[model samples]
Target: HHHHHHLPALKLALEYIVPCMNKHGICVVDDFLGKETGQQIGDEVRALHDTGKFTDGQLVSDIRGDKITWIEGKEPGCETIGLLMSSMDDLIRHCNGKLGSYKINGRTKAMVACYPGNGTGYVRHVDNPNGDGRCVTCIYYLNKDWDAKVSGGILRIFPEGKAQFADIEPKFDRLLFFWSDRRNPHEVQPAYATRYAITVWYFDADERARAKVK
Candidate 1:
């Protein structure tokens, strides 16, 4: 009781997140970041976008659209990436506790991607494109005042098979977290407006550790 009082927000967040992840292997948290912080990150992303640092995603399997710029953290102009990653560390710890054998590693990096409005979208795909690493996928939407009427660019989550799954609109301050296994295949529908998101892939630290020994 006393400990819960000290961590009301964390406890509440966990209560809301754990069950969703357990039941569907995917969870969505609305307004995960407050307005000021979200705006700061969004501004930074737009700044980078204006500088032409974001490049088109390489065509792989069905991921042919979107312009992305990798953020390595601690760079001259990317201090916010490190802060956002630190917040993700707290989230990952909570998620790892509920995910059983699946665990996210410490070496995870992130990318800021922009899916243009010109009928651009990624085909359905899983995270382990190379059959290596990647335990979980986390994405945060920064599109300010996004509306479904804009059409397309929705994140489709298929937990079991090819049947229709959950559709998530790219609302501002929204976050989506899911396991990276084949069971949870997903895709992005082509959009009519520009969409921006920060995607971070957490690796299987245990698997990577084992690989180091080999």
Candidate 2:
């Protein structure tokens, strides 16, 4: 029939995200990309990984072990980034509404990463303002059928005044959005099965401009 497809999932995600973010500065959406789109994006990332396009995750600080490839908007062979770019404007508009003082611009970037199995993970850290202007970090995971016992990689996020933490599972088509500045302290716990995800960072244009002038 050659039907034209629509992204109802993305629409729902937007509706579900805005309120949650306004309340807590973070949100998670299940089935964010729909099943087919998630599979396609994951397959494309694996292809890029196979082609040696990915490099070893930088081993700075206590963070150790993972492979990553940055996908610029409209970059060749990066279908996922293209899909993400298509929705960036709407996402950023919603984001700016809640962030009274902070702002995100069109200069956003995405990265695909694989945290290998066998207890490999990043240590606790904060996304410091390194002058590149990142203000919001969004992660869309593509790992299907995760078993917490065997595939133990979990994202642990620490809130401002809570002594406890929130643990997020990297399930298929699950998307997470959170503030990426010094306010959030998070880490990835080790896993036994490879975990795949696309990480997108939205920049604060004002911060970028100020950093550049310095």
Candidate 3:
């Protein structure tokens, strides 16, 4: 194993956010690799997003919940972005070998996703059910010229019911990390204007989940 630096908010995050989650959960870490590094990776992810070939050739679902437009894997041209690659490596390191395969729904997975808002909003819910102990959710905000008034997408998390949102501003150079199992129930607040986020998830020992339709 390589030596890993303790990030700025890593210790504090473990103290504050990790406890809020279910057993073996974690929270946001600021300056994990430095603000500039994180943002550079976010940009590379966005560049891949532009090509629109990341997702498997199908629509997983479009009936209810969030209306999203995306491709699944890293885009073609920007594949060599060091920041994106390194962060993924760090996520695996963070799990200390607990993170597992994500080969569900006949998809060869990679980290890169995009959500385009068009007068639709996601109802409050956690990530996929199979995301139990095996899953960790990572979201990277990709709005360069972001303005709260124009970009209204906010993720609301409640450690306990009716509590204030574990509000993390969707700042341009911000990345939000959390465990994506039942323990964390969160929702995306509606956005009047378009919003974009690059979502990546870490799976369990086996890729033991599916894109189940509700």
Top lDDT hit? 1
| Best prediction by TM-score | 1
Per-residue lDDT of 121 in model 1 = 85
lDDT of each model, Cα atoms only?
0.77, 0.74, 0.51
Cα TM-score per model = 0.86, 0.85, 0.62
| Reference-based TM-score, model 2 | 0.85
Candidate 3, overall lDDT? 0.51
- Relative to the true structure, candidate 2 has a C-alpha RMSD (angstroms) of 3.4
- As for TM-score, the candidate ahead, 1 or 3, is 1
Model 2 backbone overlap count: 0
Q: What is the per-residue lDDT of model 2 for residues 1-214, given as tens digits with 9 covering 90 to 100?
A: 2474545544544666666666676788776666887887878887887888878887422466888877875766676657865664466675564554677665556778888787888888877546567777888888888877778899999866766667999999888888787667888999889888788777788887887788
* Candidate 2 colliding pairs: none
Clashing pairs in 1: none
Off by over 4 Å in 1: 1-9, 59-62, 161-164, 210-214
lDDT tens digits, residue span 1-214, model 3: 2465655344443444445333334355444454566556566655555655445312554332333334334545554343454464455454433323332222123444344555445566677555343466776665565665666667777643444457655666566666676656776666665455656665553444433321
